[PDB]
Each structure stands twice: as structure tokens, then as C-alpha cells.
């Protein structure tokens, strides 16, 4: 390989000489310690390498070796249940090697080379193969891990390994032209993985929370944004998303969080249990962790590593949910890197290409036809933490121009014990109209109009708050008091959800449709009662209200009979009582 | 209802494209027979002359090793050096005074550089 | 003993030396001129043609004909030992108490390595600082990073000295595992003046807290690079003690604003393009490399707790220094100028303060069981009384609802007795008793944030501050 | 309130613009000086 | 013709590379950059001197090296092949087909930057366009040859309004007294940094309307290289001008997001080290935007017309 | 309905043969035309 | 050159009530009309070109739309000169350098227009000069200074912009020509901040 020596050291920047033939953005090892760096500029026989770690103690003349490949990740069995840094280094192995600290220059493999895996072939000799096809299956924590031929590899199979126990390194399939395919391959993190075709978003990404599902839905392969105010339940909401989503595999990326927050997420997760199998939830997740004091390059490459892993699992034909803990910290890391390179800042110190990078990261999500002919999707939910909760900050503005949904968490609602604490004002979703035909075909023909009725009731409640504040709720007419009470019923019986209850933590679409039907029936019958003469306080004591309030906490298989009984009670009560 | 119209349009477009690719395939296959037939001594000489005219400060002239019976006399006509590379068949290339600038004058390059205008022209004859 | 001559350029803080390929990047060197005086310096850039050295102090007597440069350390190291307790140092490890130099157990690089996130564990125990406003409402947890936000003329140094004097653990309240680990304080001062230095020295000597603490003191006239190095020395000592000898270490850093200004000057000295608002673009990473060295570790009993202290430039929380500090740390303690001018000490303002880790270090088995509810009720009542204090000025006292008079009296008594504790030291139980006595002035049934059993246990007590809470 | 907020936004924008202009001029002059000192020698 | 290869690459950094001994490269010429693996990416000469030439790469410079890379001239000025058979086709914003059909046969090759219309050759627009929206038709009337952008925001439905305008547009000859029935508008649609959701919406709406047979699409997705975003509106307007002023078509041009174009322009200008404007944008942004917007209008003695409806989102309103 | 679609498919597959039948009558003339220009 | 400069004492009647009443401008005076886009700078200048008592009108379209210059060519020949009664276009001189025309010509157009105005003044006429936008001229100067690698003063403008503007505006005024006759030049310049 290309080998040279150092001629100048200045901070993290190292200038090498004798490196003619080195390529841009390749990975280089600097000094005898083998510190990893990236080539950023070439001129003559000189290369500019940006060392990731600290360069104290280095001397002029130490060797520099280029690997000839850009930053990349290993894709194969053994990524689930693991904890990785921003450049895919297993933290448990690092601890077992160097104790409680992370020393400079440690080398460990992303995939454990020693563990045996149960191979089961699928191809036969002489079969023509093309990138994206499945060569075989290996079990992994109850998943059928399909070994995929690398996207660019093409040829005809010469030899197949018979079924048995093998390590990751053993070549399993050999093509006629001499190329060898093993259980893993390598892919650059900054190039999108190819697909046959991107399908339009036509099915919802069922999050399990009524507010999210009905008022601000996100489609499969869609994108969403969420503010991160303190004490608003963001961690609990993300954890519930991980636990109860439709997605088969969950990828969580920490990209520069506080040490204690990362400790909390690292400790809480091993205790969780997914409802699908009752086993550890960690068997379906991949964790990428970064603290504030880790190198800047790892923080910058963390989201690319995470989304590359998500794209791989999508290529295996699965449905993947990807959470980025704070894109603001990643933007801060990007700004620091840009300042290192002496670039001209554009706005508020950020580099001019921030929006391009955010768009390129968010565009990897979608529902596609894989090269193997299967179907998969990647859904990205990204948290944004502006400085003072001000959404005029440039990162927030750039994010809101490309995402399809925005879920405004509010601390006031959490302080009011309304959970989840998501405002219905400010929050919006662009996927509703596109998802409406699926709703009509799947859940009910009248779902969209009923949802619009709920939204209009909420808007009517919000439209008269000034008089309520000025005067008080009791000194109001029958119509206005009934409207505000119906709004309270909605807020406390349909929007609210308890993430710690056994049967309320998850809610299907049929259950929400039933709740909305009951609420609208009650409201219409109450308006009819007012038309035929009634006092609102008389209506407030009807037991059908207590039936509707107890409509939560019921089993989903018990829900249809409960809904029918509640509808009959609503119809009967408003004729027996004024 | 316009789906049938678009089907007709795509069918005719694909047919025209398949005709043009076959035309260019026959052109290139006929062109490939020049070094095998006794036609090279003039075409290769003219290509070398064009290459030398395009790069006045030529040092060396790398061409087909099969043209050496002509190159050994044609290079000294201009006074430039000569080299052979088998991978450069059906082409003559001249390097610069320092070697940083090279002109390549293979017939395949000529075809693939004129093919756009030739595709524009052939449609007048075929249809 | 290799010594380098042939200086080719001297200007400002930098000098260029040729034929110096052997110098490692970041090495510390000694500069000696023709008069025999020795100056310090650090190598900031190494090349084949020359090396660039930043001189610690002024370059008044230097010349290109007789100056020589010699190596001292390949990388900045500090000798550490258990015997450093009771000593004072100048910020680069040089003793200033007049006592003999320590005998090191080992020499450690002052730029410590980052902790492995899988080796960390959740903070679970609190520290009793002796101030009611902190212990009750903004409790400090072992392993937390809880900075203090102060103004320009506010008495932050007095509060720092008091906390260093009064801080202790409470193994007794843990119920099980009733055994104390050794406790120590590491005190770092950056860019202080002579008056502050004398005040700190006298405060530490008068009480005997010196025998249980280590002091790193850097003055305003000292070299800026020493100001940069001081917190790293302090944190190296703290990490060594905590994770080798199982100590509970409390680290106090004073005037992080001075550190930020020193960093800005250093960055301008290397001709680096300044970032937003004149500060270096890597300021966030630099601050994180200091703050993130605290915490608790699995399999070890020791811990490190940090209390950074910084003065906001124009009382503006949007300044980059407090903004980044808020990004990195887990809350803040805010000092109020109005309380200071009203004569209340310590002038901690409970309303804008917050501790994010408080809920994990209080409650049954850790402290007295009603801690969180009492804190919430106190906050609610004080916030409700503060605005009534303003409303009275326009509507008059006679126009109030009867409960509003109770709220007014509660706010006044809370300021007089709870916050204004003076120089006395209060345990957690005494502070909770004072809090309950203050709450007893409100009518029972207005305590919406507390369960009835706790009220039945502790309601109905007169002011214990005059009594001293026996 | 909206008038005060508009004034604050305008002042912030003006200050940020002046800061950016100063940074650009500083970088330009530093580049010219470095050119004189290193390319021309 | 025959190709010349330049192997004297001196310096690569960011989006720029320097070629040493290339005195023969014309200013503004288009080149092909071939690396060791054989992958070919495009570039453009932005500054040429006796010492060296400056080529700006259209995509990321990953994998380039000073030992094996070579540069070849393509043409002295950027040109695009145009023909009437472009209608109903789909392109990737650099002039390459993506609908899987074979490349078109060019009738002419034209410079993408175009030429300024002579003011004495223009004529004053006079024809009323009925868009079916009262707020526009009565109060903000649109005329053939006008350039009338739409100012929107993050969540506002500008795309739906553009689709409705494209669907409902008509001329109403009877009122003007022309009497002559006219063909519907041909639509040239250029997208810059568009997402999959909006692209799918536009494609489905055009399919439902049935206007694909009358339309040309230049689609630059948001994950495409940022530098290529500059050339998309110029190619679209070259095609529109050719159709309108050589085949008497009435063209309606829609530009998806000029904000992305301006962001790409700022990203280029920052690397080029030019004098910034008011908020970091290049000082020459006005001229650059004018060279795109001024290509609409009508010409005396000709029947065709070009009408532009650019769409841009005001940052933070 | 679908019958018109079937008729259109018939027309398309008739054109897919008619075009190549037209082209095959003069193909070698175009081959010679291209060859006389590409060669020097 | 001129023989002597005189103080202006007669009004330049623009035909607009507000301008002629509240904010008059004299024959040898200068006026600046800045405003945002869509405010009405160009329409006001064209109204002054159509309705005014000046003998000769010189219009300089420095870096603006081509339709604005096409409208004048199309419609001015159909109008009537308020004084002589002939076609309006017979008294008008147009210098047009649109936005997409070469940048460096914006600077030259201003000087060409003002020199023509000075010549017609020297013939003894009263001349009105309309500069469509001096901001585009300043942009051209900024671009040229950028290519020259100079140092910017404010918002990237070269430090000598004010001197150029003052030199351009000082060519106006009522004078005594070298032939002993009297003439004047009135400069109305639009600005696009
Ligand atoms: N939807 C919910 N259902 C039940 N409990 C909730 C819900 N949301 C929040 N909580 C409560 O709040 C807790 C943790 O979230 P909290 O509201 O305190 O903010 P946080 O998530 O700690 O702060 P941040 O959002 O900054 O991470 C849990 O103890 C939980 O009881
Ligand atoms: N005096 C006026 N009477 C009627 N309409 C006017 C008048 N002034 C301006 N307008 C209207 O404003 C529009 C043209 O404005 P104009 O072109 O003068 O703006 P501008 O200041 O030149 O802006 P820009 O310099 O950006 O072109 C037309 O719609 C016109 O109807
Ligand atoms: Mg105008």
C-alpha cells in the first residue's frame, strides 16, 4: 500500500510526504500507534490527513500507511444485541481489553470472529447470481439472517459450502471467476445502498399511540421530527415507540449526548421486553452511543453508520425504525469539523452545506423493492433540540423543510399530567391525505370524516378559551359549556394514554375508531337534547360518560362487544333522560 | 384511455432504439476488420499524422505493434520516438513534451465521439 | 542533555527554532537566555524546517544570538500521591505553601482518557452541602455536574468556600451499608486576584478543611497556559484519588469564564480563525473534555462530583459560555441580585434553579421519605406568593382573598428563614424540619402536592429557626 | 410585544452580518499575508 | 474527432482540482474526469491560466488520486441535444434518460446558458390566461409570457396550487376576439432537491390529468449531487425556448424549489472564495438568478411563448 | 373498456414490427454512411 | 466643460401632484427615489418620461427587465409630445443594458447616458435623465473589485463607491454653455436597497 512519513504536525492535522497515489477520503494510520485519520486534501507528493484522536507525543518522521478504502462498516451476523460507538467499535470488547477507559489506538473487530454460526445453503453450483440475492440463512436471536451477495458482485456459483457450523470469516460461496463470498461484506457509509425502486408511502407506520396514529400519522418509510424539552417524556415516548412499533428491528443512535443520559439509555434497555415474544427487547435492537467527550469524527459519522445498518436490515426484507437522539448535537459536531477546515461559515456559524447533508441523510428512508425482489422500509424519527426552544434556529428550519411530520412535545402538558405531552396545535402531518384510502379500505369507510370531526371539536374548544379565562366555565351558556365539556372528554379519554398500563400502552386503529364513534354519537345526541330542552349539568351525570371513560383499559378482543354496549347505552340514555 | 397511445409510443421508441443499436453494431464490427485486411497502412498513417498535427510538441508516438513496419519509417519522418502497446490496437497516441498531455486517435474513439451526429443523420436515411 | 540553539524568529508569544525534529508535538521545553534566567514554553507545531514554541511568560530579554531551548517533558505529566491532601499548588504542580515537594507514586498524563459508557452506572446517593436551598430543593447527587450561575458583584467565592467547608456524605441515612468512605475536596481557582487568594487561604486554614482538600491556585498575572492547564491537573488528581483509593471527591472549579477567555487568547495566539462571537469553534468540545470527567463507575466505590462556577458576562444566559455549560451539565444554581441587595445570604434563587438528577438521589432508603413532595410544595407556594407580592402593590392588601395573606406571609417567612441561613451549617433533617414549619403556616388542605399521611406525620409546627431545630 | 420582537430580530441580524463581514476580511488579509510569506518567499 | 488526455493534476481539495499543463482548455469547457477504477464523473473549467486550470467537479471527489486520474475535454461550451421527441420523456436533470428508454436522437445542439433576447425583438404580452382561481384571475391576472413566482413556506401547499394551475390553465380566445382554437400548454417541469413524497404526488397528479404526453421532466432528487442542481433550470429553459420559438408551442415552465438552487449556489460560492452578499450568499446572485428568470417572454413575428411559474419557500416566512 | 386496450396493444405490437420492417430495407447503406465518416 | 454654473430657480414639472407640490425639484436639481421591490420606482420614472416639460429625455435602463424597455419602444411612438405635439419617441434616447446582459456594461451605460445628456445640454436644451437603478451599477463595481482581489469596505462594496456616485451626480445642474446659451440637466436616480 501507499506508505509515507510525517513532515508536519499541527493539532489534529498532520501533513505527510511521499504519499503519491493516495486517494481522497481514504482511511490512514498515522504513527506507530496506528491512529486512524482521513485524507482531506492532496497536492504534489503531499497528503493532508485529519487524525481522529489526540496527537500528543507524535514526532516528525513516523510512518503513515493508507488502507486504500474510505470509512465503511461491516455488515453480517452479530450486529444485533450489541452496543457500538460512532464508527462501529464494540464497547464491551473495549472494556474487556482496556478496563474502564478508552485508550488511543485500540483495534477490535465489529463482528465477533470466533463464534460459530449455523449455515444453511440456498444456492447450488452453476447457478447465476446477481447482487442482492440470498445465498443462505443463519438463525440469530429468532431472526432468519439472510446472507446477501454484495450489491456489485455478479457471476456464477462454482462451489457452495454444505450446511454446518462455521465462523464469519470462512468463505462460504465461491464464484467461477475466483471471487469468494463470506457471511459479511463491507460498504461505505456515505454511499446509499442500491434498490430496484422506491414505492410511494401508502401504509401507516403504526406507533401504538392514539394521538400519533390518528391526528399526526407517519407513513411507512416516512420521516418525522420531535423537540426534546426536558421533563416532557421524550425518552418514554421513544422507548414506547421502540417497544410497540410495527418495525421488526430498531436502531437507536446516540450522537453526542450527556454521559448520564447515555448511561440511562444503556441501563434501561436491557430490562425491556418486547410484547411479540416476551424475551429481551435488546434482541431486536442495535445501539450506537456517543458521549460529549468522544472524538468529533465519530459523532459526525454516527448517524451515517446507523442509517447504513438500517439500510442493510431493510435489504434483508425487514421493516426498520431508526431513531436519532439529537440531530442538533450532530450539527454541532459538523460545525466544529467545518471550522477546523477553515471554511467560510454561512449562517449562525454553520457550514453552507448543512441542509444538503440533512436532506441526504433523511432521503435514505422509504419503502422500496429490494434487489432481491422482497419489500422493506426504513422509517426515521429525528429529535431536534434548539437552543432555547426557538424553532427559528437554522437546523430546525432545515429539518422542517424536508420531513413529512412534526410532533411538537410540550413541557406544559407534562406539567399538567397530560401524557403523552404532544400539542395538537403546531403539530402537523403531511401523510394524512395519502393514507386516507388505506384507512377507508382497512379500518372503516368513515374514518377520515370522523377524525375531522374530532379535530373540529378540538378547534372549537380552543376557539373560546379567552372568554373562559375571563369569566370561568360555570358562567357560560349551555352550548358553549357542552362544547368545552366534550373537548375535556376528548382530551382525557382519547388523547391521553398510559405507557405503564398492561392494555392501554397499545391501541389499535379499530379501538380508536370506536372511541371516536362513541364520542361523536354522545355529542350529537347531547346537541339534540339541548334542542329539545335540557340543562347541561343534568347531562353531566349520565353513566354513559363513565362508560366512555372506562372504554380505555379494555382488552382489544373485548372491545367490539364493549363498543356495541356503549353505543346502545348512548342511544337509550338520551331518551330516558332529558 | 391514453394508456394505449403511450404503449404504442414506447413500443415504437424501443423499436427505433433497437434498430439504431444494431446499425452501430454493424458499423463497429465492419470497422474492426481493417487491421486484418490490407487496409491499415494508410488509415493508421493518417491517424498518426492527425495525432502529431494536434500536439505540436510531441515527444513519442505510441501505436499498434503491428504497424511497426510502417511506424519505423513514419516516426523518423517527423523525428519523434516510437513505442508499442498491444492494448492500444486500432489506434495511435502521441505523448507531450513532458508526457503530461496525450492525444489518442483510435477508430473506436472516433466512432463513439461522432455517434451522436451520426445517429441524427441516419434517421434521415432509414425513415 | 541535548540543547537546541539557532532561534530564527521571535515575535509576541512565539519563537521559531530550527533543526528541532526531535521535539514531540505538545512537549514542554525550557528557554534560557544570556543572563541565566529560565523560561517555560510549549511546542505547538513541529515541522522539518522549524518548530514553533509558545512562551509561557514575557519574552523581554530574549535574543537570537544566545538563546537556547532544551526539552523537559515529551507530554505534560503530573506526579500524584495520597499525600497531596493538605497542600497548595500554583496550577502546574509547583508547591506554593513552602513545604517540601511530594514524592510521587506515579506520573499521569493530565489530558485524561474518556470513560467507557458501558462502564458507567447511574448516580444513586446525594451529598449534604449544608445549604437548605440546595439540599432540599436542588439536591446534589454523587456523580452529577451541577454548575452555579452568578453575576459580577455577587458573592460566589463565599458560597464556594462554604460548600467546600461543609460538604459531607451521609452513610447513616442509607440504612444498610452504614459505613463511610473517605471524602476529599479538590479546589481549582483560575484567574483569581490577590484578595481572593488571601480570602481562600484564610478560609481553608481557619477551619481545618485544608487537611481534607487539595488546592490548585492560578492568579490573574500568571501565564495563560497555566490557566488552561489548572483544571486538567485538578481533575487528574480527582480521578486518581477516586478511582484508586475509593475516595468520594468533590471538585469545585471557579470562574470558568476566565478559562474561556484564556482559551480565546490562546486560540488567537495560534492564528486560528475565531468562531461565533469570537470564541474558538471547538469550545464545546474543549468544555466537554473537562466536564465529562465526573461520574460513578461500575465495580468501584469512589465517585467524582463537579460544581463549576461561572459569572455570566452581561447577566445574559444566551452568551455562548452559559449556553454550552447548560448543554453539557445537568442543571444549574442561579444567584439573584435582588436577594443579595436585600441582605439575604446565600442569595440563591429557587425559582430559576433546577437539578436534573434530583429524583434519582432522594426518597426512601436514600434520604427522608417525603423529600420530593415537600420540595414540590415549597416551590409551588413560593411561586404563588411572589406574584401576590406584586399584585398587592396595585390592589392593596385589604382587597386580597384570605388565603392570599397566608401566601404573602409564607413568602416573607420563607425568604427570612429558609434562604437566609447565613454562615450556619444545617443537616438535611433540620432543613426539612424548617420546611415543614414554614408549610404549617399554610392551611391544611392547600397542600395539594403532598399525601395525607405525610401531612399527618409532620404538620403543625412553629418556626424552628429561632429554636435552632433541636 | 411584536414591535419589540421585530426590533430584536433586526438588531441580531445586523450584528451577525457585521461579525461575518469582519471574519471574511480577516481571512482575506491573512490569506494574502500567508501567500506573500510562503508562495513568493 | 480525437480526444486529448491531461494527466498533470496538481492539487485536489473539496470540489476543485487543478490541472497543470492544460493551456488548451477553453474557459467554461466541460471535461470528463476518469479515475483508476474507470468511473467517469463530469466537471467544468471555471478559471484557466498559463500556470494551471481550475476545474469544478459536479460530484464528490472521493477516490481521486494524483497518480492515475486523467482529464479529457468534451466540448468547449456546454450543450444539450434537443428534439420534439423529448415530449413524454423523463430525465435526471443532467440530460440523461431515466425512464429506461433509449437516448433521443438530437435534432440540434444548443448552449445551455442561452443568449439574451434583443429588447427590440420582443413584443408586449397581451393574452389573458384563465387559471380558474378567482384570486389570481380577477386580482393578480396572469398573461402569457409572464414570470410569476409563488411565495410559500414549510407547510404551505404550494405544490398543490401549482398542479391545479397546470391542470386548469386556458386561454379563452372568444373574449379576446382571436377566435382561433389553440392547443393546450406543454409543461416543462424541473425539480431541484425534491423529496420522494412530493415527486410521487406530482407524478400521480400528472398521470391522473393525462398531461405526460405533453410534458418533459428534469428530476434532480434530494440525494443527488448538489453541484448538478445548477444546470437543471438552464437545461429546462433551453428545451422550453427551443420548443416555443422553433415549433410554435405555448410552454408553461414550473421550477420546483429555487431555495435549493440558491443553497447550492451559496455552497459553490463559499468554496470558490468570493465576496459574500447580505447573508453569506454570493454577491453575484442577482445576475445568476436573472440569467434564468429572463428567458421567458414572447417574440415578435413568432407564435410561441414561454411562461414561468417558479416556486420558492421563504425561510421562516 | 378493456377491448380498446387490447386493440391498442395489437396496434403497438403491429408497429413494433412495421418500424423494423421499414428500417431493414436500408440498414447497410447507413452502415456505409457512418463508416465513411468515422474513418479518416 | 461649461462657462458658468447657475443657481436653479424654475421647477421641473413632473406631472404628479405630490411631487410637484410637497417635494419640488428644480431644473438643475437632483432627486433620488429609493424603495423596495414593487413600490413604483419604474412607473414613476416612466410617468416623468411621458409627462414633463423637459425638451429631451434620456432613459438609462441599467440592469433591469427587458419588458420594461420593450414597452417603451412599443407604446411611446403612439403618444404625443406635450410641448411640440409630435411623437413622444422623437425626443427620447434609450440606453438599455438588461439584467442578463454582460455585467461590466452596467457601469458604461451610466456614463454613456450622462455624456449624451451633457451634449444635449451644451446644445442649449433642457434635459431630464432617468437612471433606472444605481444599485446594479454598485453590484457591477462590487463584482469587478472581487475579481481584482481588493478589500471590501461595507457589504462587499469597494471603498470608492461614494466618490463614483458623487462624480456621477455632480454632472447635473443649470449652466451657461460655451456658446453663450443656457441649458440644464436634471438627474433622477432610483435605488433598490
Ligand atoms: N405517556 C406517559 N405515560 C406514563 N408516564 C409518563 C408518560 N410520559 C412521561 N411519563 C413519566 O415521566 C417520566 C420520564 O419522563 P419525564 O416526563 O420526567 O421527562 P424526561 O423524559 O425525563 O426528560 P427528557 O424528555 O428531557 O428526556 C416517567 O417517570 C413517567 O412516569
Ligand atoms: N402610480 C401608479 N399608478 C398605478 N399603479 C402603480 C403606480 N405605481 C406602481 N404601480 C403598480 O406597481 C406595479 C409596478 O411597480 P414598479 O415596477 O414601479 O415597482 P418598482 O419600484 O419598479 O419595483 P422594481 O424596481 O423591483 O421593478 C404595477 O402593477 C403598477 O400597477
Ligand atoms: Mg423597475
Residue numbers in the entry:
A (entry chain B): 1 to 578
B (entry chain J): 61 to 187
C (entry chain D): 5 to 474
D (entry chain G): 169 to 209
E (entry chain E): 3 to 319
F (entry chain I): 81 to 120
G (entry chain C): 194 to 386
Question: What did the article's authors report about this structure?
Answer:
V/A-ATPase is a motor protein that shares a common rotary catalytic mechanism with FoF1 ATP synthase. The V1 domain of Tth V/A-ATPase (A3B3D1F1) is an ATP-driven rotary motor where the central DF shaft rotates inside the hexameric A3B3 containing three catalytic sites, each composed of an AB dimer. When powered by ATP hydrolysis, the V1 domain rotates the central rotor against the A3B3 hexamer, composed of three catalytic AB dimers adopting different conformations (ABopen, ABsemi, and ABclosed). Here, we report the atomic models of 18 catalytic intermediates of the V1 domain of V/A-ATPase under different reaction conditions, determined by single particle cryo-EM.
Cryo-grids were prepared using a reaction mixture of nucleotide-free V/A-ATPase, containing the regenerating system and ATP at a saturating concentration of 6 mM. The reaction mixture was incubated for 120 s at 25 °C and then loaded onto a holey grid, followed by flash freezing. In these structures, nucleotide densities have been identified in the three catalytic sites. Hereafter, we refer to the structures obtained at ATP saturating conditions as V3nuc. In both state and state structures obtained under ATP saturating conditions, a bound ATP molecule is clearly observed in the catalytic site of ABopen. The catalytic sites in the ABclosed and ABsemi in both the state and state also contained density corresponding to an ATP molecule, and in these cases, the associated magnesium ions were visible. V3nuc in state and state are also in equilibrium. The V3nuc structure, obtained under ATP saturation conditions shows all three catalytic sites occupied by ATP or the products of hydrolysis (ADP + Pi).
